[PDB]
Design a binder for this molecule. Structure first.
Ligand SMILES: [Mg+2]
Ligand SMILES: [Zn+2]
Ligand SMILES: [Zn+2]
Ligand SMILES: [Zn+2]
Lengths: 99, 199, 575, 95, 123, 145, 570, 83
RNA sequence: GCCACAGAG
DNA sequence: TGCCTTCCGAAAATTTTG
DNA sequence: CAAAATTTTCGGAAGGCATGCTCTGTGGC
């Protein structure tokens, strides 16, 4: 939250984000804006691409493609806001390893 | 009865197992993920046999554990169609007889469809009756070595239901899953049974 | 045995695919069909009414209600969508320019493209080069549409295709109409369509002569019902030259017309906070969705038993305006409704929106803001954190075989003496335990080797230090912390030049990283010793400042001569 | 570098950058989002602003390479062990 | 106030219920029973479908073990399927690049013939 | 996980038993190890064995099921006594006859007895051999290489 | 609603996943997947979705096919006349073959048993002992294999009498024009053919002309038009029984060329059947037999259902549209085979028309009686027959097909929405444009039912709502609304609706046969087929009879849907 | 495979500052989860200072995998890089 | 939680 | 208070028909 | 040549963004 009257924190604005990019700090930016700010565990079905819940995709009626991932909660909020606007932010997933 | 399966997988070596031998660590996590578990449409894996090819261990940005792509060979309990096998009779019921191979693959279910003709279950001593003629009289008793041929193998995947259905089941049970891997055997020739029947 | 092998492969996002949702996708993902304008039933305990714009099936807003779709509290439900069916289709306030473009690009009598096959083949070959980008693709679409307009007559029928445009081009209720002027290109030839039009008007003017004055403005309007039925008949092979890929089932023009409005989860429209009232309030989205449900109920009930067409079209226009202002509340004013709101488009743009308020930059934990005081006796890589600030700021240190005794002592010292610990978390546990509601002696002896303890910010820990106007890259730097008890952040004055800091009530910020990787990142790349040169021109920017250069001048003056005692005193003073 | 003086504005960033999310973070967010949903344009997440939005490691700076740990085993030790039953077998009596 | 202007033909009770039926309730005049000539027509359709599905132009849907047993002796697959190249082909009708998979050199043999006077319905 | 090929080779039961006994001995899982190290004396070296209950249980059950007497007389399997060169000699003597590869596989998995066990394990015994070859191979398999 | 349904119930029970696909795509894909396999279905699906495609583009788009599978699928589709191709050369000289989709093969797959039934009816051979089975089997073999040569089909039979009957029956089938010689014409698109002919006739004109560009264009267009009319009708006239007397003074179909089903003549027959069904409504029952004989005498020489010149993209010029209409009226009036008198129709009435007391003028197949029947046909409201000269008659296909369209559409909308729908549709089709009050005065029925029925008609595009504003800025709050009938939008909408219903029926049938594959496969093979009683269990009998009964109902309803969908192609 | 042969390499052998930062970060994260240290420690407990003391005398068992733009990758041992 | 001013660098 | 794009009649300029 | 089509060029209106970056307070709905 905002303000010292609600035990709030400090803003890390767009200019500070650009300044951290200017050093080549990737891990620090990931820590600041995802790990310790709004981390959230989500389940994504990598055949359609929409969010589910509790290891279940509510479109395909199956748990055959559910994958646990970590995103900011603001990302999930944006995706649901877009979905209510009849925009579908379908996610596509690749392997993190070349395998 | 035992076959070799070439299985490729992504194995996770934690940082706190660097001090051990590398092959030992791969073996340990492979036994963690694979041993005494069934690989679907493959069979049941007991342990791993040898590692064939390993690659350089990559690292995920955020955690220090090393991930390695290993293509290993694993022993699998996958008998073919026609391999005679011996088990120990453990249970019976009006739908068939349950036999287990003394601690390994407890689920073998001999039905009455391919079993010997003329058999009938008596619900008074919990036994089947197999008369060869008027003179012979014997019962399908328990705790003896029985020989049979695996006639059918059943491959069914288990799916978690919708969490509403799972919650309903949890609320109902507080006030028997299908077996994922099963071999169905049969006896249709001379000597297909207990040794004492065929001295 | 009977346990099935569990396979897990870590994944990343490869790329987003932006599309629209067909009717099947909007209904299939839904859980409840919102068909009642009542939010709370007054008869029983102010509960959320079933089949309503607020409903347990779409989530919860308090901490004492369950979802009954996933059975979680407010912190454990990601949201569950609803769906709403409209009595008559309405247009989309966002894709309206897209709808105008596509009806420009098709015939209005048989729903086919206006190009001949030769130009169509040439343009299709033009789109599918391997090197196409966004600019070239939109340019080719612009040229295709400009070729569509130039056509006189369709090629599968002899119909006339005129000019498609808006009605008033303003902020009124007319802003969501489409006019298809069909005889501005009719010319002076025979034109049988003109004959049909004049015969129709020769028939209708016999009983309403007063309408003869308005024959010039009566143009063939395209309501969403006829627009939708013109969309359904468009050949799927024609979607490519209108920008829509026709491979996926959602890639159809019919998708861009509102037939199913997805009711957003209550997690993205929670109950607005109340100060002293015994009741509660609801966000503008909930109220306006209830407004939509009521208007659609009115339209369907009016279609069941006949009403004059003027009233039905008026309420249908009100539904269109209410949908449009639900999605976007800048193009249309609330003045036209019978009788601004925080819509979706006003939550995605602006300084305090989402894309610039909570995604591209967001408030972080583990920060602290304090006024600034000088301290020259501190090394130029060391900032001074007060005693009462380092007792709340903490670093999560994981116990290893090298720091067991140190962390045991930190845990015993407690959360009230500075070299102490404030939280402990174990491997077998999922919730951290406070170190003040405990014994602080049993936890030392039973410390697992894989535990994590949030120790106090002691000497040597890496802190990010920042000043709010971040004009260039030197504004955020990394310092080693030193603990000194005077309630103010203190940094060496040679470091204050990049911060543009003046000890005049100035306020600077202190973040603390959590993972060791980010700590090493900050200390090795962001460090003040490693960054003494601005990349503006390579000049040194962390050097002597005012009153340090004066001391240098006074020492190095020609008329200075120090004896041996003063020399050795200065030499021992500077080190 | 696109071939014409595009400039630094919304109308230049539209003509330079193919990405959707990065243009969405700048100006006219809803218009770009709706146009991207209409034309159905793929958005490969490689841009830095997209990476920060979706919460994953960017590919500039300290994300340009993957640090790799080498397994210290040779190819001679990973020779497969004997398959005695298959090795001693032959097919000459009947096949 | 908003919900206060109802038209001439409605009251306060009709509104407040937004349940548009998703199931249909309006049938066509084609829905009736089956007559004798229509039965023969349906037999003709189903016979043609069953003929073509096994015919030389089907394409795939996109024990069974290789072990050496002795049940395979004097045992043979109950039918020999027809491939893509086992039919007469007019060389002029087909395009040029399609000559690879089809067999110009291979002999053109198959010409089936089948029709039944007895219905293939078990009812 | 991605399965590359299902059945790379076949395993005799002797190979499985030998590999599992080697694994048991290397990790000191045998009853002799617990009798000598764990039981009958106090522990001073603190050399704990391998700690994984599931693999230990499955290996113990498999070795117990393989090593014991099989359905041919109501002592041991016979496999737990015969060695590598014994297997070579036995299965080379098997190679002289017309039985196929998988047939040799069940011949080396279990061991057929005189009474109709060869009839069950071999397909169509009468269509294959006369009496003398059957009785001599029964003698050589009952002789344990 | 006794119990509310969740969206899961809507997705499972109600067909909602199927409402988001185009009727054309859904119909073609379900038909191809029903008859051929899934690979042909996917190839046709991408061909319809993305339009013209090449083999490399097909490999890139469809996932899971190599080039060999794609080429096998394309050969299978090309044999069944289901994909058209065109070889195009570029400037560099790299020739590439583009593939399309053609309607004819799909419609053949959708018209199979109806084609068999119609050719059985049009055989008209007296005292057939084995000939009917032979015609049925030769037609089925022709349709299933796409195209076949007569010689290759003759080699499958060795007996002499049956081979002679093959020769006679193929001669008979080709005589009326049901089996026509195929060529590269049926596999190239009409648009590409017209473009090539026009460009060759335009580039061939001598250069440096001091003559006008527009009229040079029209002159090249007219020469291309007459060559187009020569080339399209080439197989239609006669191309397969031109040979006379190979041996022993007999007429045999050419034993050198392959025959293929002629779909457009079958469309002529179905339009004739639709006209007969319309004539069975206003006048007569024996008079219907008379008009049926009149159509069946002139069924072969009838004009096309759609003019191939109309699909050539030459409708932008209004003068060419009027010229097409006038040429249609030209050909339909004075074709040298469509004109007949009473005596020509005398020799075709079978022995069931009585006509002794068929008419009463007061308030043996003779010329006067058949003339009276032709006259009462000529006096009907719809132009069933027209007289270029008193005594000779011609059927006006140019001015009767719109009438048949209107009548069929009005009866459909009446049977599905009620007689109020008929009343309002006819009231707003007679009057060109009305407000509400003109309806309320002229159509004598209550106000609210007018508003309800007319509101229900807008949803299916029977009436278009025309706004007339009374304000400086347009608004429906104060405006007057008129109601019109646009025939084209309505006809197209109901055509696509019927296509969707047909495809929904076939999808449900395919799902039923796929879900119950075990029993159908057990009963499928020949040793049990016809003697299913001995081995099957009591429940299996009920299951098999349920499956077969549902299949028969599905295909019967498909035929009944075709009987309404064929009209809207014309 | 896709990797350039080790005999010839067309990238700069001087270790970039970002490579040093990532090596120290990964080593500190690995030591923070009970990994062995090959360098003798004089008593230092915090993982990151031990990581610096480890790299100061080149006993880090990692290898840096450099991505060229096309997709081919080269391998560089931390022993081989010079500082 | 929404608006309005007041300020600090 | 400045700046820029897109859209659309309106009138001037061109090719195009008779 | 002058009547008409057809394409181009020049305005007024409507939209958008800027109006920094954050931080702390009251006062009242
Ligand atoms: Mg100041
Ligand atoms: Zn899914
Ligand atoms: Zn929930
Ligand atoms: Zn048109």
């Amino acid at each position: 939250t905002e303000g010292r009257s609600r035990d709030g924190g400090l803003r890390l604005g767009e200019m500070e984000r650009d300044c951290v990019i200017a050093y080549g700090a990737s891990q620090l930016l990931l820590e600041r804006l995802m790990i310790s700010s709004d981390a959230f565990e989500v389940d994504v079905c990598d055949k359609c691409g929409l969010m589910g819940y509790s290891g279940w995709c509510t479109t395909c009626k199956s748990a055959e493609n559910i994958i646990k991932m970590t995103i900011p909660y603001a990302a999930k909020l944006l995706f649901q806001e877009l979905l209510s606007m009849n925009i579908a932010p379908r996610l596509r997933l690749e392997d993190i390893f070349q395998q | 009865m035992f076959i070799l399966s070439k299985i490729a997988d992504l194995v996770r070596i934690p940082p706190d197992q660097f001090h051990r031998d590398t092959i030992s660590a791969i073996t340990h996590q492979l036994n963690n993920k694979f041993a005494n578990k069934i690989i679907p449409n493959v069979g049941l894996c007991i342990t791993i046999y040898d590692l064939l090819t390993v690659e350089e261990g990559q690292l995920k940005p955020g955690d220090g554990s090393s991930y390695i792509n290993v293509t290993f060979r694993a022993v699998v309990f996958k008998p073919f169609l026609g391999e005679i096998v011996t088990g120990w009779i453990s249970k019976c019921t009006a739908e068939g007889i349950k036999v287990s191979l003394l601690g390994i693959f407890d689920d073998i279910f001999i039905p009455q469809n391919m079993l010997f003709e003329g058999c009938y279950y008596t619900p008074e001593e919990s036994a089947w009756i197999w008369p060869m003629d008027e003179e012979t009289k014997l019962y399908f008793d328990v705790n003896e070595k029985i020989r049979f041929r695996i006639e059918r193998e059943v491959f069914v995947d288990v799916k978690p239901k919708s969490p509403k259905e799972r919650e309903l089941e949890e609320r109902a049970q507080l006030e028997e899953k299908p077996p994922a891997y099963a071999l169905l055997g049969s006896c249709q020739t001379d000597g297909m049974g207990l040794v004492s029947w065929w001295e | 045995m009977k346990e099935v092998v569990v396979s897990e492969t870590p994944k990343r996002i490869k790329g987003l695919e932006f599309s629209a949702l067909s009717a099947a996708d909007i209904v299939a993902q839904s859980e409840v069909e919102v068909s009642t304008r009542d939010l709370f039933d007054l008869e029983k305990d102010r509960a959320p009414k079933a089949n309503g714009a607020l409903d347990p099936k779409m989530g919860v807003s308090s901490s004492s209600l369950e979802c009954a779709t996933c059975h979680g509290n407010l912190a454990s439900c990601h949201g569950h969508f609803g769906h709403l069916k409209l009595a008559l289709p309405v247009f989309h306030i966002g894709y309206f320019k897209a709808t105008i473009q596509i009806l420009q690009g098709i015939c209005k009598n048989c729903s086919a493209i206006l190009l001949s096959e030769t130009d169509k083949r040439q343009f299709l070959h033009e789109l599918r080069r391997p090197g196409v980008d966004n600019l070239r693709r939109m340019g080719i679409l612009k040229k295709i549409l400009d070729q569509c307009k130039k056509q006189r007559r369709c090629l599968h029928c002899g119909a006339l295709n005129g000019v498609v445009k808006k009605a008033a081009a303003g902020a009124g209720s007319a802003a969501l109409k489409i006019i298809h002027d069909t005889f501005r290109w009719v010319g002076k030839k025979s034109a049988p369509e003109k004959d049909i039009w004049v015969g129709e008007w020769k028939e209708v003017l016999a009983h309403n002569p007063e309408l003869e004055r308005y024959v010039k403005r009566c143009m063939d309007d395209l309501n969403p019902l006829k627009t939708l039925n013109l969309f359904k008949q468009i050949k799927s092979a024609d979607c490519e030259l209108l920008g829509i890929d026709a491979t996926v089932p959602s890639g159809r023009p019919e998708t861009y017309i509102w037939r199913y409005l997805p009711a957003p989860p209550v997690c993205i429209r929670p109950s607005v906070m109340m100060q002293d009232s015994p009741a509660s309030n609801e966000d503008d989205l909930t109220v306006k969705l209830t407004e939509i449900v009521w208007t659609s109920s009115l339209i369907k009930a009016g279609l069941d038993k006949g009403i004059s067409i003027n009233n039905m079209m008026e309420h249908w226009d009100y539904l269109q305006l209410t949908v449009a202002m639900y999605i976007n509340s800048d193009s249309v004013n609330p003045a036209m409704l019978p009788g601004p709101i925080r819509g979706f488009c006003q939550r995605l743009k602006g300084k305090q929106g989402r894309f610039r308020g909570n995604l591209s930059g967001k408030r972080v934990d583990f920060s602290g803001r304090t006024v600034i005081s000088p301290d020259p006796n501190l090394s130029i890589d060391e900032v001074a954190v007060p005693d009462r600030v380092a007792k709340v700021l903490t670093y999560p240190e994981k116990v290893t075989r090298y720091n067991r005794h140190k962390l045991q002592e930190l845990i015993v010292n407690g959360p009230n003496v500075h070299p102490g610990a404030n939280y402990l978390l174990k491997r077998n546990e999922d919730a951290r335990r406070n170190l003040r509601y405990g014994d602080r002696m049993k936890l030392a002896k039973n410390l697992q080797i894989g535990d994590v303890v949030e120790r106090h910010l002691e000497d040597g820990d890496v802190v990010l230090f920042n000043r709010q106007p971040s004009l260039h890259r030197l504004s955020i730097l990394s310092h080693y912390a030193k603990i000194r008890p005077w309630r103010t952040f203190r940094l060496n004055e040679c470091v204050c030049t990049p911060y543009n800091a003046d000890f005049d009530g100035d306020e600077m910020n202190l973040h603390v990283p959590q993972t060791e990787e980010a700590r090493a990142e900050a200390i090795n790349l962001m460090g003040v010793k490693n960054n003494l040169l601005t990349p503006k021109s390579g000049e040194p920017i962390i050097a002597a400042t005012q009153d340090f250069i004066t001391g240098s001048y006074l020492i190095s003056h020609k008329d200075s001569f120090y004896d041996r005692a003063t020399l050795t005193q200065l030499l021992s003073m500077m080190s | 570098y696109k071939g014409e003086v595009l400039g630094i504005t919304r109308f230049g960033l539209s003509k330079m950058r193919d990405s959707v999310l990065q243009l969405a973070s700048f100006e006219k967010t809803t218009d770009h989002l709706f146009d991207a949903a209409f034309y159905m344009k793929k958005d490969a997440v490689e841009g830095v602003s997209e990476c920060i939005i979706l919460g994953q490691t960017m590919s500039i700076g300290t994300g340009s390479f993957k640090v790799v740990k080498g397994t210290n085993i040779s190819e001679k030790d990973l020779v497969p062990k004997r398959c005695l039953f298959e090795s001693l077998s032959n097919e000459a009596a009947l096949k | 106030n908003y919900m206060s202007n109802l038209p001439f033909g409605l009251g306060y009770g009709d509104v407040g219920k937004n349940h548009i039926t998703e199931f249909p309730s309006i049938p066509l005049p084609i829905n009736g029973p089956i007559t004798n000539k229509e039965r023969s027509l349906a037999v003709k359709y189903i016979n043609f479908g069953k003929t073509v599905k096994d015919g030389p132009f089907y394409t795939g849907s996109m024990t069974n073990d290789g072990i050496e047993r002795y049940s395979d002796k004097y045992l043979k697959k109950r039918k020999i399927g027809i491939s893509i190249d086992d039919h007469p082909y007019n060389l002029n009708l087909f395009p040029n690049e399609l000559y690879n998979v089809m067999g110009i050199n291979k002999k053109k043999l198959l010409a089936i013939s089948k029709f039944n006077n007895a219905d293939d319905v078990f009812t | 996980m991605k399965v590359l090929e299902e059945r790379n080779a076949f395993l005799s039961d002797y190979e499985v038993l030998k590999f599992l006994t080697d694994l048991e001995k290397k990790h000191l899982w045998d009853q002799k190890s617990l009798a000598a190290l764990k039981k009958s004396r106090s522990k001073g070296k603190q050399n704990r064995p391998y700690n994984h209950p599931e693999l230990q249980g499955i290996t113990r059950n498999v070795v117990n099921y393989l090593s014991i007497n099989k359905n041919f007389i109501n002592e041991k399997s016979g496999i737990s006594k015969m060695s590598d060169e014994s297997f070579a000699e036995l299965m080379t003597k098997l190679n002289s006859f017309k039985l196929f590869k998988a047939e040799k596989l069940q011949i080396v998995n279990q061991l057929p007895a005189n009474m109709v066990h060869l009839y069950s394990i071999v397909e169509e015994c009468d269509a294959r051999f006369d009496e003398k070859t059957i009785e001599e191979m029964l003698e050589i398999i009952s002789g344990y290489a | 609603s006794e119990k509310l349904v969740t969206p899961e119930d809507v997705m499972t029970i109600s067909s909602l996943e199927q409402r988001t696909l185009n009727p054309d795509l859904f119909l073609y894909k379900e038909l191809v997947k029903a008859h051929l396999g899934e690979r042909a279905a996917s190839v046709i699906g991408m061909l319809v979705a993305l339009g013209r495609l090449s083999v490399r583009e097909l490999v890139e788009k469809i996932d899971g096919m190599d080039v060999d599978s794609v080429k096998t699928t394309l050969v299978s589709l090309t044999q069944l006349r289901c994909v058209k191709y065109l070889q195009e050369t570029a400037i560099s000289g790299k020739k590439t073959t583009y593939y399309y989709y053609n309607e004819e093969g799909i419609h053949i797959l959708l018209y199979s048993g109806l084609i068999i039934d119609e050719i059985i009816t049009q055989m008209r051979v007296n005292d057939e002992e084995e000939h009917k089975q032979l015609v049925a089997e030769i037609v089925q073999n022709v349709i299933s294999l796409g195209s076949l040569t007569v010689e290759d089909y003759l080699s499958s039979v060795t007996s002499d009498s049956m081979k002679y009957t093959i020769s006679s029956l193929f001669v008979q089938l080709c005589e009326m024009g049901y089996l026509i010689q195929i060529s590269k014409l049926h596999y190239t698109p009409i648009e590409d053919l017209w473009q090539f002919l026009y460009e060759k006739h335009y580039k061939n004109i001598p250069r440096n002309s001091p003559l006008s560009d527009l009229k040079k264009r029209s002159q090249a267009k007219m020469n291309a038009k007459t060559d187009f009319a020569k080339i399209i009708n080439k197989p239609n006239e006669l191309s397969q029984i031109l040979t006379v007397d190979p041996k022993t003074s007999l007429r045999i179909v050419k034993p050198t060329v392959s025959l293929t089903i002629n779909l457009d003549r079958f469309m002529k027959g179905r339009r004739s059947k639709q006209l007969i069904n319309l004539a069975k409504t206003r006048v007569g029952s024996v008079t219907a037999q008379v008009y049926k004989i009149a159509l069946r005498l002139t069924e072969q020489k009838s004009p096309k259902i759609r003019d191939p010149l109309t699909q050539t993209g030459l409708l932008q010029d209004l003068e060419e549209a009027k010229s097409f209409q006038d040429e249609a009226e030209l050909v339909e009036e004075k074709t040298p085979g469509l004109t007949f008198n009473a005596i020509d129709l005398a020799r075709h009435l079978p022995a069931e028309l009585d006509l002794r007391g068929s008419l009463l003028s007061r308030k043996p197949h003779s010329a006067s009686l058949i003339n009276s029947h032709l006259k009462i046909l000529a006096s009907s409201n719809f132009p069933f027959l027209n007289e270029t000269k008193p005594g000779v008659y011609y059927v006006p296909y140019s001015k009767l097909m719109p009438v048949l369209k209107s009548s069929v559409y009005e009866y459909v909308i009446a049977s599905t929405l009620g007689p109020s729908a008929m009343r309002l549709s006819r009231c707003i089709r007679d009057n060109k444009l009305v407000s509400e009050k003109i309806i309320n005065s002229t159509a004598l029925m209550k106000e609210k039912d007018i508003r309800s029925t007319l509101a229900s008609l807008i949803r299916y595009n029977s009436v278009e709502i025309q706004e007339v504003p009374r304000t400086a800025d347009r608004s429906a709050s104060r405006a007057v609304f008129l109601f019109r009938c646009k025939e084209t939008h309505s006809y197209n909408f109901m055509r696509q609706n019927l296509e969707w219903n047909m495809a929904n029926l076939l999808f449900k049938k395919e799902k039923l046969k796929q879900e119950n594959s075990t029993l159908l496969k057990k009963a499928n093979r020949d040793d049990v087929k016809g003697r299913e009683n001995e081995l099957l269990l009591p429940s299996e009998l009920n299951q098999l009879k349920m499956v077969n009964e549902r299949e028969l109902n599905v295909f019967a309803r498909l035929s009944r849907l075709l009987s309404l969908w064929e009209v809207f192609q014309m | 495979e896709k990797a350039i042969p080790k005999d010839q390499r067309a990238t700069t052998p001087y270790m970039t500052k970002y490579e040093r930062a990532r090596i120290l970060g990964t080593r500190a994260l690995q030591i923070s989860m009970n990994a062995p240290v090959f360098v003798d420690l004089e008593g230092e407990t915090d993982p990151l200072r031990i990581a610096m003391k480890e790299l100061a005398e080149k006993k880090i068992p990692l290898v840096i995998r450099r991505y060229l733009p096309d997709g081919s990758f080269e391998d560089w041992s931390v022993e081989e890089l010079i500082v």
